[PDB]
Design a protein around this ligand. Structure first.
Ligand SMILES: NS(=O)(=O)c1nnc(NS(=O)(=O)c2ccccc2)s1
Ligand SMILES: NS(=O)(=O)c1nnc(NS(=O)(=O)c2ccccc2)s1
Ligand SMILES: [Cl-]
Ligand SMILES: [Cl-]
Ligand SMILES: [Zn+2]
Ligand SMILES: [Zn+2]
Lengths: 221, 201
């Protein structure tokens, strides 16, 4: 009944076989992740993050995750989408014109009506990322998460309609995928891939039906 | 006992009318503007089957006319009508719309000067399909669904903002071929549809 990553029937091809809830994992017409390659060039995104000690930092459902009480928000089209948690994927699930990065993080948001907004940004092999240390460094009175420092000040982003990359693979997801990589050290990566128990948590690319993707740019602060 | 809030209970086949997260029609009210950039091309031709079905008038033909979008070939199948127009562009009322089923192309009709392109509808007539669409068009494009059951998702919708013109008698006359009953699906919940704005010849 427990779902997972690799080849065996408890696999990617067969999420839908695992539960009737995960049917859309097969039946859905806007499933993510995908390889983002045809888009239109052309913003109404606004940021309310604050430095916060997590509510919980825990590995759950195959992934490392940090949760927060809802003090942090994202504003889209005059609507506020509140941050509930932040989790990690390795390697990066969404591909930008065939572009994997060893790590990505996903900011999960919901609005008043319960509509979903999710932010993805990839990581590069590079200098050490300090914003990572409160998550790994510390397990227990929790340590600050640099939410205001986490994201680039300036970003190019892709916006499109897709789906959840983990069950129930729910559609109607507002996806924002930042083109700008953040940078992480190599042992932070090894340690964190080992803390995600070193089994790749990258959902294979989903079918593409000429999704409308836009590319844009914003200030996050 | 055969209604819209209820399409999903009529069949298990039709649940996506309710479970769907990208259902049409909806209100086109937030959009993105963009340049002369696209791929959309029209190979319509004057073409000479007509029948009333499922609340709707529809004319279908042989696979002779097709459209180019992003390098994919889409063959036109039929044209059918909705009154009043289902999709809304900035709350834009419209007495009549038409759906070019291929990717579906919608364009509304307004009361005014008679549309000569409508009369062959009101051995079949030549239809001036080549005369039917504006040579210059502005449209809204996004991914949506069929507006009638089974409400299939994955539909490349293109909504041209430019109105065509209908007489009142023409306006009245085919509602009767639709049995004077409105075949307009209410606006569905929207989950931040990405809409792009552009224009084509
Ligand atoms: N990979 S993905 O699409 O961002 C996610 N898949 N499942 C998730 N579960 S979750 O982040 O804990 C969550 C939390 C609140 C509402 C909905 C989902 S996020
Ligand atoms: N109103 S809408 O979105 O254009 C449609 N909804 N259902 C349709 N079915 S149909 O017109 O009979 C048809 C005809 C040929 C191929 C596919 C579908 S069209
Ligand atoms: Cl990602
Ligand atoms: Cl319409
Ligand atoms: Zn995720
Ligand atoms: Zn229609």
């Amino acid at each position: 009944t427990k779902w997972d990553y690799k080849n065996k029937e408890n696999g990617p091809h067969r999420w839908d076989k695992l539960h009737k809830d995960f049917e859309v994992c097969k039946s859905g017409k806007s499933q993510s992740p995908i390889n983002i390659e045809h888009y239109y060039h052309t913003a109404d995104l606004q940021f309310k993050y604050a430095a916060s000690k997590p509510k919980a930092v825990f590995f759950t459902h195959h992934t490392l995750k940090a949760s927060f009480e809802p003090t942090n928000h994202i504003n889209y089209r005059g609507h506020d989408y509140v941050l509930d948690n932040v989790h990690f994927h390795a390697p990066m699930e969404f591909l930008i014109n065939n572009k994997t990065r060893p790590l990505s993080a996903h900011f999960v948001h919901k609005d008043a009506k319960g509509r979903l907004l999710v932010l993805a940004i990839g990581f590069e092999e590079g200098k050490e990322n300090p914003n990572l240390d409160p998550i790994l460094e510390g397990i227990q009175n929790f340590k600050e998460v640099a939410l205001d420092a986490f994201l680039p000040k300036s970003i190019n982003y892709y916006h499109f309609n897709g789906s959840l990359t983990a069950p129930p693979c729910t559609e109607g997801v507002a996806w924002f995928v930042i083109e700008e990589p953040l940078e992480v050290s190599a042992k932070q990566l090894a340690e964190i891939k080992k803390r995600m128990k070193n089994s790749p948590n990258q959902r294979p690319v989903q079918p593409d039906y000429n999704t409308v993707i836009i590319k844009s740019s914003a200030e996050t602060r």
